[PDB]
Each structure stands twice: as structure tokens, then as C-alpha cells.
Structure of Laccase:
Amino acid sequence: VQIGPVTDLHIVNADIVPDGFVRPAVNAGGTFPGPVIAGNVGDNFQIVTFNQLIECSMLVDTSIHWHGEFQKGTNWADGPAFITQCPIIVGNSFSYNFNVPGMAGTYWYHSHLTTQYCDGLRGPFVVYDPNDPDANLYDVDDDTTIITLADWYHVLAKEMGAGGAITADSTLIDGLGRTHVNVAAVPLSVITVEVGKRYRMRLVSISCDPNYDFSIDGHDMTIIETDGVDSQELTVDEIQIFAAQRYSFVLNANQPVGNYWIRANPNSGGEGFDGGINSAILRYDGATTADPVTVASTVHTKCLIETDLHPLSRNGVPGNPHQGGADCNLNLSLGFACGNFVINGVSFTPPTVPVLLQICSGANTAADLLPSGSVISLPSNSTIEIALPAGAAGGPHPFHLHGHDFAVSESASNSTSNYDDPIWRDVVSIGGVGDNVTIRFCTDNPGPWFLHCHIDWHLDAGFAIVFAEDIPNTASANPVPEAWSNLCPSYDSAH
Ligand SMILES: *[C@@H]1O[C@H](CO)[C@@H](O[C@@H]2O[C@H](CO)[C@@H](O)[C@H](O)[C@H]2NC(C)=O)[C@H](O)[C@H]1NC(C)=O
Ligand SMILES: [Cu+2]
Ligand SMILES: [Cu+2]
Ligand SMILES: [Cu+2]
Ligand SMILES: [Cu+2]
């Protein structure tokens, strides 16, 4: 179901049983996943979020992030609690009013308070391009070609310990899947295709943690979009997609009419596909209504490798073709010990006053912004390079930056940098010990922008910092509506 660009979005509690185990959830728009929020590039989104949550066990306060949307001019609408807003309290609503100039592609939205999106507040967000340069590559692109991959837990997110290796209890594809342990034969999702059509499949990781090895028995996939950036066609037979990443891929429905397994193996939790875990069904029209009996290739012979991706446009790479070839080059020291993560020696703990309101109330430098040591100021109109060397306890961490996308100058498991034509994206695996995954972008967007590992349990254990981009121009760049200003006194009064 698709809603928007102007829409109500109610946040409710419900019990659901997507793997056959009933448990409480926090839902957007009443469904899991939430409804697809959609519009065309350049359209004004007005999402009126009604908080109606009553179940404390999962927090009755909420805040929603439109993941990958740059929010230029609207930093107050970005969503991370205590970075850009205080949460909306139960009984109140809040109108997320923003534009998406320049952006088209496949995105998603999710709670951005504590670990609440794990408890179910996650949904797809698609910005359609009426002149998409990839349109001639397929026949079908609509709500039925969206595929979400979700980890699902039988423990309430607020009770996960924390951390604490945490592992999921079931992989859901389009909201359905089977439990890893004592697997019950509950219904699987079906994706239906017709012989000879081509499909723009929009593959969205709404994961709180695991990365997935996604494949479709007997079929190939040609990638045309990465995290909202159009890419040159890259045909693969397997895609490893980390938390929060998105790909569009053309599925040519060119096999005999029949049932084929769709596979999504998480890097932790249940291994393999016994009893149909980690599975959905690709069904051709005409096929018998029965489970697939297909098998994966024994060896996947063309798996996605991030360095094989290239932008469709001529994006290039800001700055100069060598490391440190930037105006403000940084190399973050990413650590873990004693159950907390750290960036440059400091574990992130949300401050009482949101970063944005600290700035609007007259804070001027990172030194003046709380939490101390969790904010790095960035100057305006400068090429930023950030090196994110891996090694920190497990691993592999998908780092994500708000308000921007970035050139992936160096990828995982490959020490060679690329200053000509790397893919740009917004969430990137930093790989393994010895890797030096490096990103570059330009500061053309004033505001406080969160940078963190998108494994939500790692974010709650402190793996984050805020890039305060152009403090001096932040207030003037981001006029806030009074409803925004009303957020924090309501929150602090209720709490
Ligand atoms: C490691 O990463 C580099 C950088 O993207 C890759 O190097 C490119 O390789 C292709 C050939 O496959 C050449 O056409 C380009 O000239 C290379 N670009 C640069 C900047 O060197 C390399 O392929 C990657 N290694 C593996 C094993 O995938
Ligand atoms: Cu996100
Ligand atoms: Cu984001
Ligand atoms: Cu992490
Ligand atoms: Cu975030």
C-alpha cells in the first residue's frame, strides 16, 4: 500500500505474529512493514505523524527519520532523537514537512529513538523519477516490486542485553518468514512475475543488525540503483546487502514457469534454509501453487563486489587523487570495550537538549555543544574525507551519514582507493580488521548530521558522532515551525 507525499501516519501498538509467535510491536500506519511512503522528485512531503503509543515496554515516545533524504533547509525534520528534535510524546502529532530536490530512488523510514525501530517502526520510502534514465530497462515498477528484508526478534528491544551479542529469531521478507528455532510452517511471502516481463525490484534492507546474502534461484539480477544513486548496469547472481542499504535490480522473468526460492541469509541467526527459513517464493503466473524445490548455485559465480559499481552520472570524486586530498580530512578511531562503542575515545549518549536546539539557542562551536567530544564541526563548502578503519568488535559495521551521500573512495576487503569513479551511497560496510573504508563528500548542507553504525544495538551502545556542519549558518538555513519548538517542553514536562 502506498501513501503520500501528503499523508497522515499514525504510530500505534499492535501484537503481530509474522513468524507465528505473537508479540507486541510499534507500527507505522498499522502494518509491518509500514506502508510505502511515495512521491516524485521535487515533491513537498507532508507527513503528519500521530503518536498513539501506549505500551511503555517499547517506549511511548517516538521520532521518525526519512533515511537517505538530505533534508536541506529542513534539518529539524530529519528525526534522530536528541540530535535534531525531542521525541513526539503520546497523544501529540507532528508534521514532517520537507522537500526532496535532486533525489530519486529507494529509501526507507524508521524510528530514530533508542532501539524502537527494531520493535517494528520501519517502512519503505520511494521517490519516483518521471524521467528516470533507467525506465527503458524494465516493464514493471510499482508497490509489488518492493522487497524488504527485516530481522525480527522475539525479545522486546528494550530488554535486549545489550551489548551483548544480540541475534534475531527470524528473517522476514515482505513482512513474512519462519522462526530460526523450532520452525513452524507459517505462510511465506510470494513475489509473482509473468514470463518475459522485466521488473525493477527495489531491495530495501530494513534490518536492525544482520547483513543478508540475497539471491533468487535460477535468476540473475542487474543492479541499476544503489542507496538512491543510479548506477551503470551490473549483473550479479548474489547481493550482500548490509543494514539500511538499498538496491534496485532488474529481474528478467526468463525461466520456465514455476516456483523458485528467494533466499536471504543473515550473517548471524539461523544458517541455511531448512523448513523454509530465510526464504520467500518467486512464483510465475501459471505455476502450481506449491513450495519451490529449487537449489541455489553451489558456488555463486558473479556476487556483487562494491568496487564493480559505478554511478550512471558523472559524479566523480571531490578533492584530490591521494589520501588526505581534501580540505578537512579525518580519520576516526572506532573502538569497542566493556560493552560500549567509541568514536575518538567517546561513547555517544544522547544529550538532554537536541543538538539542533543547542545551535538555535546560540551555541557557536563544537566545544560549546553537548555531548562533549561527540560533535565535530565542519566548515562550509569544503571537501571532507573520513577514514573509518575497521577492527572494532563485530563487525562488519555499516556506517551511515545523515544529510548526505558520499563517494566510497575505498571499500571493504580492498586496500586500493578509487578517485575516478567509485559509487556514491549513504550506508557503507567498513569491512574487517586492516580495512580502511574511506568516504568523501562536500559540505553544502548546514545542520547537525548524525554519523553512526546502522546496527541499531551498536548505536544504542554508543557507536556515533554528530557532524555539526556550518554552525554559523544553521539557524538561518533551517527556520523551524513552532510545532518543532513545542516538542521539547512537552517532552521534558511529560518526563
Ligand atoms: C579493488 O578496488 C579497485 C578500485 O576500484 C579496483 O580497481 C579497478 O579495477 C578495474 C579492473 O577490474 C580497472 O578497470 C580500474 O582501472 C581499477 N580502478 C582503479 C582506480 O584502480 C579493483 O578491481 C578491486 N579489486 C578487486 C579484486 O575487485
Ligand atoms: Cu536509517
Ligand atoms: Cu539516515
Ligand atoms: Cu556496528
Ligand atoms: Cu541515523
Q: What stands out?
A: The radius of gyration is 21 Å. The domain at 1-133 is CATH 2.60.40.420 (Immunoglobulin-like). The pocket of copper (II) ion (ligand 2) is lined by residues 65, 67, 110, 244, 400, 454 (CB under 6 Å).
